[PDB]
């Protein structure tokens, strides 16, 4: 009943109980059940989408709402990446020149050819 996908099935039942679904993980685990691990009692009706609400379904997190958690996750990524990118601007310059190598950058040692020295060849 509660979610959009359980509602969408409402035309698809005729004479099947319209069960309001509750995630089995959120049932209090100190009550007693015929199957304690699944937190189910015998002959208990199943929602049409029961496979998405039983104990083997993906875990549900209660502390935050899903929307707010999305806000926090996007915000963390945004602030981290934006801060790093901005920091790239305010950077000191190095003090030593990048090193160099004999034979025009050892272009022969890294394969290379007379006719093709830009492809293979170091800073020389």
């Amino acid at each position: 009943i509660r979610a959009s996908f359980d509602k969408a099935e409402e035309p698809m039942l005729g004479d099947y109980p319209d069960i309001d679904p509750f995630p089995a993980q959120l049932k209090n685990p100190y009550k007693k059940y015929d199957d304690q691990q699944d937190r189910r009692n015998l002959e208990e009706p199943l929602s049409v989408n029961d496979d998405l609400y039983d104990m083997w379904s993906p875990d549900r997190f209660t502390h935050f709402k899903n929307q707010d958690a999305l806000k926090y996750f996007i915000g963390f990524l945004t602030i981290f990446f934006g801060a790093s990118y901005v920091a790239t601007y305010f950077v000191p310059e190095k003090a030593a020149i990048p090193r160099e190598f004999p034979y025009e950058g050892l272009w022969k040692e890294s394969g290379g050819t007379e006719k093709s020295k830009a492809f293979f060849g170091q800073r020389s």
């Binding site: 199957d35 304690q36 691990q37 699944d38 496979d51 083997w56």
Partner: protein, 481 residues
Amino acid sequence: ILLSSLYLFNRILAWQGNVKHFYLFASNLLLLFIVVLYINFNTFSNSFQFNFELFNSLNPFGLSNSDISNGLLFGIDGLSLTFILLTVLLIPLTLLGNWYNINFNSNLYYTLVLAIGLVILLNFWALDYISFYILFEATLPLLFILIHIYGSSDSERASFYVLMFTLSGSLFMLLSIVVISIVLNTTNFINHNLFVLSLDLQTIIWLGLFIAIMVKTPLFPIHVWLPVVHSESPLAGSMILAGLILKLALYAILRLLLPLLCEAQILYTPMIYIISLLTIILTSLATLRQIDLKVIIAYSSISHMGIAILGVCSNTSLGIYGSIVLGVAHGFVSPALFLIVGGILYDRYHIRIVNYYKGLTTYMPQLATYIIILSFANIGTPLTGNFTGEFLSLQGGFIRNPIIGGISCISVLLAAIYQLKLTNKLTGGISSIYMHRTNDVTIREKFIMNILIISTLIIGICPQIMYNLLYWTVNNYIYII
């Protein structure tokens, strides 16, 4: 001989009353005979070898020694020998997997099962379009009867599906075969790559052949009959339908389509890739929301068949070798999974709903170990033939079209998801409250499962061991200028 052997059959039936020991003996002899044929098969030759003709006008009841060929032709090359070996390995196991659970009218049941096996075996020997089509259709009434009389609660709808869908596709194949017949006045597979039809007529003939392929493989979107038929079939029916009958479609692609309609096939390949990618992705995702064990196992076969299709239509040697290896490995592993769900669990509990099963490891550790092994084999763990087939099929698909094969690489994940989701619940947790403890797997059930696992492991460790029958085949059908 035939007279004497018929007398033997008659007396055995008179005294024992159960035909099944005789059928097991006949099928074991057939397997030995095929192995002897393999011993005398020349591998340094791409020509058909053990040829014979039936129903020639000069000798309607014998073999044809005439200068005019108007009967039905039979013979084998390496490609057909591969599938024949798979068939004769599987048939006795399909007899043995129903040894104890068929009690009323069992002689008819075993007769139907053995007949279906023999028809498929002959189908792989057929050397012309008409003989192929005849043996292709002849399984349908036998399957209809077998499923209707010995299937589970919904087996009437299932028998009607297995007849009607396959007839539907086969009749369009029949249109194509009639057109080939009247346009070329020849129908045989020995020289049919020598006939080059105009591109337009090629394009038309291809459509009928491919509609039949689409229903028999099956491919999206005409697959929905296979879960029903597999779910309601008795065990031997499911084993034959998943291990052998679906391979007939891959064989049909190689034997009936590629040599004759090469240019049209080039033109049509992107459409095939669309269909196969849809098959893989959509059927893999649809498996996630199934609640019947046998239905889940059945849905798995469709995605693996999609991967095989992508390989066999890749116009590469690696892709065709991968498609054939995948077909063989699936023929090993899928009958084992059907044995577990519809032979072992179903014979103990007579129910297939997933909610009832949980934590089988406590009382049946051996069955749980078999489940784990067969699951990781089914999702293509390396050193299994399934991995070799899938990997080579994906290589060929990626070469044929990098984007489409690259996206096809998600099947690794998707198959892992549905299969391991099932096995996680089957083995883990506390023993279910709804079922009482039963025996762990028996000696017969373990024997069947062991045969299948050893076969898939042997071709998984050394897939090259099939190459001596197939190295001509991986070049016979690619079209490169």
